[PDB]
Amino acid sequence: GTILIDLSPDDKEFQSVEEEMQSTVREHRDGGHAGGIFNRYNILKIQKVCNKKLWERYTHRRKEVSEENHNHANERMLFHGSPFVNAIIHKGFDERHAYIGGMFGAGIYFAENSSKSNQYVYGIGGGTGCPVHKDRSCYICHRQLLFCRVTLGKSFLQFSKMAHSPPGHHSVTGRPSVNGLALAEYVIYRGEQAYPEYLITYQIMRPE
Ligand SMILES: COc1ccc(C(=O)Nc2ccc(C(=O)N(c3ccncn3)c3ccccc3Cl)cc2)cc1
Ligand SMILES: [Zn+2]
């Protein structure tokens, strides 16, 4: 029961998501190893993901989380990148597919920087790159990110094995560093604690 609502470029909702996409790009200090070399995206399409069951699941959990955290959900709009985007918009996030060796264990990973989530689109460390060219900096193939509604509740701050949130907490927040560049990473351990609200189709742009 997922319906995709194709948003017009003149729509403020489209523009808002587009600006969040572009403004949160950072210069990773890994030469573009994982996600490619770029300053900007070519934004092709933004679709609103409408699924009534997934949404009700999300808000049911958000209530429970809110009650356990002094009537605060600590809800954020965050990026997700992975190879499972098309499954996710249909069936929701699912922590049973999470990877056990993740830095913060077996959860579902989000970012406030679009360009960090772009590093996971093709797998962890960007896997083997795009399917067609095996190129992690591919400028041709179109990528997809989710801009999602995420319930963090009481988030546990963790350094850079773990299966669930620590006792009394509903999420983990990390700030891992790659070369003096530390960026935020948010991790939930329940699929219902995020709703994949917008599907963004895009390319990374070749700089001049
Ligand atoms: C068939 O139905 C399905 C519906 C939803 C999912 C789903 O939520 N997949 C998913 C769950 C967690 C992540 C996730 O955060 N990560 C995974 C996990 C496994 N493989 C690659 N990345 C992850 C782990 C560490 C760092 C970054 C990421 Cl994106 C990425 C994708 C999977 C299947
Ligand atoms: Zn390619």
Regarding the domain delimited by 1-208, which CATH topology (the fold level of the hierarchy) does it fall under? Phosphoenolpyruvate Carboxykinase; domain 3 (3.90.228)
**CA–CA gap between residue 118 and residue 101 (Å, rounded):** 20
The technique by which this structure was obtained is: X-ray
Final resolution, Å: 1.9
Question: How would you class 179 by CB atoms within 10 Å of its CB: exposed for 0-12, middle for 13-18, buried for 19 or more?
Answer: exposed
- 57, containing H or E segment: helix 52-68
Residue with CA at minimum distance from ligand 1 atom 27: 109
Count of residues making up the chain: 208
**CA–CA gap between residue 83 and residue 169 (Å, rounded):** 28
Mutate which of 90, 109, 183 for ligand 1? The one with the most ligand atoms within 8 Å of its CB, which is: 109
How far apart, in Å, are the Cα atoms of 188 and each of 17, 35, 66, 78, 141? 22, 23, 15, 12, 29
Residue with CA at minimum distance from ligand 1 atom 1: 87
- 156, containing H or E segment: strand 155-157
User: What does DSSP assign to residue 175?
Assistant: -
3-class SS string, 115-130: HHHHCCCCCHHHCCCC
Decide: 176 in ligand 1 pocket, CB within 6 A.
no
Contacts of 134 (CB under 8 A, 6+ apart): 128
In contact, 189 and 106? CB cutoff 8 Å = yes
In contact, 144 and 114? CB cutoff 8 Å = no
The residues with which 5 forms a beta bridge, in sequence order, are: 48
For residue 192, the number of C-alpha atoms closer than 13 Å in the C-beta half-sphere is 12
Provide the annotated binding site.
130, 133, 138, 141
Provide the annotated binding site for Zn(2+).
130, 133, 138, 141
Contacts of 12 (CB under 8 A, 6+ apart): none
Q: How many CB atoms lie within 10 A of CB 91?
A: 14
User: What does DSSP assign to residue 131?
Assistant: T
For the chain, domain boundaries: 1-208
Decide: 188 in ligand 1 pocket, CB within 6 A.
no
**CA–CA gap between residue 148 and residue 9 (Å, rounded):** 19
Decide: 94 in ligand 1 pocket, CB within 6 A.
yes
Residue 172 identity (one-letter amino acid): V
In contact, 92 and 1? CB cutoff 8 Å = no
Q: What is the CA radius of gyration of the chain?
A: 17
Decide: 68 in ligand 1 pocket, CB within 6 A.
no
Contacts of 103 (CB under 8 A, 6+ apart): 160, 174, 176, 185
Using CA atoms in the order 92, 94, 99, 100, what is the torsion angle rounded to 10 degrees?
Answer: 150
Q: What are phi and psi of 87, to 5 degrees?
A: -70, -45
Decide: 98 in ligand 1 pocket, CB within 6 A.
yes
Residue with tokens 């546990």: 156
In contact, 13 and 48? CB cutoff 8 Å = yes
**CA–CA gap between residue 17 and residue 196 (Å, rounded):** 13
**CA–CA gap between residue 108 and residue 187 (Å, rounded):** 5
In the chain, % helix, strand, coil (3-state, to 5) comes to: 25, 25, 50
Which atom, in ligand 1's list, is nearest to the CA of 191?
A: 8
Nearest Cα residue to 40 out of 142, 114, 143: 114
Decide: 79 in ligand 1 pocket, CB within 6 A.
no
Rounded to the nearest whole angstrom, what is the distance from the C-alpha of residue 38 to the centroid of ligand 2? Answer: 15
Residue 77 identity (one-letter amino acid): M
**CA–CA gap between residue 30 and residue 99 (Å, rounded):** 23
